[PDB]
Amino acid sequence: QKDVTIKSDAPDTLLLEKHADYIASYGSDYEYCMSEYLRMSGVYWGLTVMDLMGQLHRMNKEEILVFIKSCQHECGGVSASIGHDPHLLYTLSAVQILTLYDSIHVINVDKVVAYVQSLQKEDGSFAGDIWGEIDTRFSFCAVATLALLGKLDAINVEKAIEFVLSCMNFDGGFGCRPGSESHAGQIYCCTGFLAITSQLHQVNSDLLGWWLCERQLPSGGLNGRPEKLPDVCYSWWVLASLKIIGRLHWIDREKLRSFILACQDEETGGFADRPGDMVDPFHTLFGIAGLSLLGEEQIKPVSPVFCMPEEVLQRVNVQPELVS
Amino acid sequence: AKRLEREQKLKLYQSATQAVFQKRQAGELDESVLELTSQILGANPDFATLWNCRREVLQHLETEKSPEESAALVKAELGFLESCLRVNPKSYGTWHHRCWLLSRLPEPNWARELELCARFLEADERNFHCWDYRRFVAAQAAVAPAEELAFTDSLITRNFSNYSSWHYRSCLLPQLHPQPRLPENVLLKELELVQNAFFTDPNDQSAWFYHRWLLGAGRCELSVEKSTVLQSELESCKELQELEPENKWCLLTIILLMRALDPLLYEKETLQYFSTLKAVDPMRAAYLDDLRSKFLLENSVLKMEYA
Ligand SMILES: CCN(CC)C(=O)Oc1ccc(C[C@@H]2CN(Cc3cncn3C)c3ccc(C#N)cc3CN2S(=O)(=O)c2ccc(OC)cc2)cc1
Ligand SMILES: [Ca+2]
Ligand SMILES: [Zn+2]
């Protein structure tokens, strides 16, 4: 019953020029200086959404490559920003960016692989960094990073699969760790993981697909778990997961499209989590990426596994089979 | 004033952060860093590198301080963490630091940690970070499944927002009956409990989701008690259907009950219910068509089994 009501004057058309201006100008400032701890991922979100819109050239390639090189530590891992500490999250982000730019050899790839390998535990799980936080988010970061580098064989794949499957729940979904409640974010990470490792036959697609399509609320937006408000980000995680398991048609595509469009800020550009809220780059990528999955003609096709343009993944020959 | 003060904040955080990093490069692993980071992490708990700095300081001080001084530092850290959690109970970084801290203590007070969890779950019964923390504490202290099962029951009956509690039950029940499908007596008790839940509040989806799981946890293997319980649920859902004709959960559950009882005998009724349900829940029409196609194919195979 918790939901939003979309007002009748909410945006109902795609404002592509405004979103490109919003991202191109971003970080030209309170929230910017305060979000330095996630800068590498912020850069990934910005560049990917620009590339999906055909506008990647407006960003500063040379500046970003130097920044990435300066963020790789002696252990091989990459930090969110200069002087911050290395983490799998920002290592994935960096490798995604370099793949977008066909510039993977700007960093030491052997050392990246060594770093990823070092974070796997006896049970097949992955810690995010040396301090030991375990999350299936990090299993996805590990295999997605290695897949993009052609080095999936560097980790213990069957153990990594066993751990992820040990996180499957009564409702067909997945949480952070064994016994964790199902959540759209972790379902995206685990279904993406199983796509990359060729294990989608182990998902109960009809059951999980039902849980996922029940995320759609009367407003047309999707929540991230039962009895919560809809959000553009959870919405992308749900849609991508459905696409991976061949059941994207189980949600009402026109109603979701209208919800996503209503989250645009027509003055500043950008997408917010919900209509009327303040926009950010994170929700801007997921709004645009969601629309692409729903078949919007003005946006490039997006990979539901990697959240990057399909044409980039085609180029490097990394395209996991889906259950369609 | 308001927009002006958020420049004053910006510069203090900026200068504090500057200071921490300079000290860190200088190898100054001391209590001044704890002071500087406390001023930043309260407002900015997702700044992971500053949590790393606190751990490095605490690790270093443990080497060059007395056991009594180390014990004081730990108690201060527990209170700092509790204050941070009150302000933002949904930060991955804060909950991880607490797990890191408790895992290395000599004499951890796990009962105190379980009580903290109960408190936070009273405030937000859906906080997954806190449920995850509680499972961590439960493992560390060898709290047995039956004890945690008792906790879930009190939470389920006292108010709504039950998805997290029902989920916890689904993980605990199999542990009380660890098979290398629940035993029928356990299943029957669960069906009774969940049926109370969705007849009390027919709008709470958590009960309906959990019930569907129990329906999968044989048809031509149905005992007379289970056969009779499922038939009773069927009639009870039809009663609810009258009271709430737009309730889609009861309609879907009627279809699932007929499937659990006798697919071929209830073919006609099942197809009728699909038509009504699609009208009541149109956003799910494509899912419902695929479910029906799956069931029609199953029926074809059952009809072909005929001798
Ligand atoms: C599932 C994909 N993965 C694994 C590859 C992943 O790591 O995605 C993330 C999922 C959650 C996070 C935690 C937050 C999410 N949020 C907060 C949020 C999103 N939707 C609703 N909310 C409240 C945000 C929000 C905005 C931005 C931006 N720009 C970034 C995040 C990412 N992180 S966060 O801890 O760094 C964060 C950032 C800002 C913030 O206040 C605006 C609060 C948290 C980070 C990454
Ligand atoms: Ca450029
Ligand atoms: Zn969001």
From Swiss-Prot, chain A:
It catalyses: geranylgeranyl diphosphate + L-cysteinyl-[protein] = S-geranylgeranyl-L-cysteinyl-[protein] + diphosphate. Catalyzes the transfer of a geranylgeranyl moiety from geranylgeranyl diphosphate to both cysteines of Rab proteins with the C-terminal sequence -XXCC, -XCXC and -CCXX, such as RAB1A, RAB3A, RAB5A and RAB7A. Keywords: Acetylation, Metal-binding, Phosphoprotein, Prenyltransferase, Repeat, Transferase, Zinc. Most abundant in the heart, brain, spleen and liver. Less in the lung, muscle, kidney and testis; in these tissues, more abundant than the subunit alpha. Gene3D superfamilies: 1.50.10.20. The gene is Rabggtb. The lineage of its organism: Eukaryota, Metazoa, Chordata, Craniata, Vertebrata. Binds 1 zinc ion per subunit. Zn(2+) binds at D231, C233, H283. Its cofactor is Zn(2+). Geranylgeranyl diphosphate binds at H183, A184, G185, Y234, S235, W236, W237. Pfam families: Prenyltrans. GO terms for cellular component: Rab-protein geranylgeranyltransferase complex. This is Geranylgeranyl transferase type-2 subunit beta. PFTB repeats lie at residues 16-54, 61-102, 109-150, 157-198, 205-246, 253-295. Heterotrimer composed of RABGGTA, RABGGTB and CHM; within this trimer, RABGGTA and RABGGTB form the catalytic component B, while CHM (component A) mediates peptide substrate binding. The Rab GGTase dimer (RGGT) interacts with CHM (component A) prior to Rab protein binding; the association is stabilized by geranylgeranyl pyrophosphate (GGpp). The CHM:RGGT:Rab complex is destabilized by GGpp. Interaction of RABGGTB with prenylated PTP4A2 precludes its association with RABGGTA and inhibits enzyme activity. Interacts with CHODL. InterPro entries: PGGT1B-like, Prenyltrans, Ptb1, Terpenoid_cyclase/PrenylTrfase. The enzymatic reaction requires the aid of a Rab escort protein (also called component A), such as CHM. Belongs to the protein prenyltransferase subunit beta family. One of its GO terms (biological process) is protein geranylgeranylation.
UniProtKB/Swiss-Prot annotation, chain B:
GO terms for biological process: endoplasmic reticulum to Golgi vesicle-mediated transport; protein geranylgeranylation. It catalyses: geranylgeranyl diphosphate + L-cysteinyl-[protein] = S-geranylgeranyl-L-cysteinyl-[protein] + diphosphate. GO terms for cellular component: cytoplasm; Rab-protein geranylgeranyltransferase complex. Most abundant in the heart, brain, spleen and liver. Less in the lung, muscle, kidney and testis; in these tissues less abundant than the beta subunit. GO terms for molecular function: Rab geranylgeranyltransferase activity; small GTPase binding; zinc ion binding. The enzymatic reaction requires the aid of a Rab escort protein (also called component A), such as CHM. This is Geranylgeranyl transferase type-2 subunit alpha. The chain holds residues 16 to 441 of 567 of the full protein.
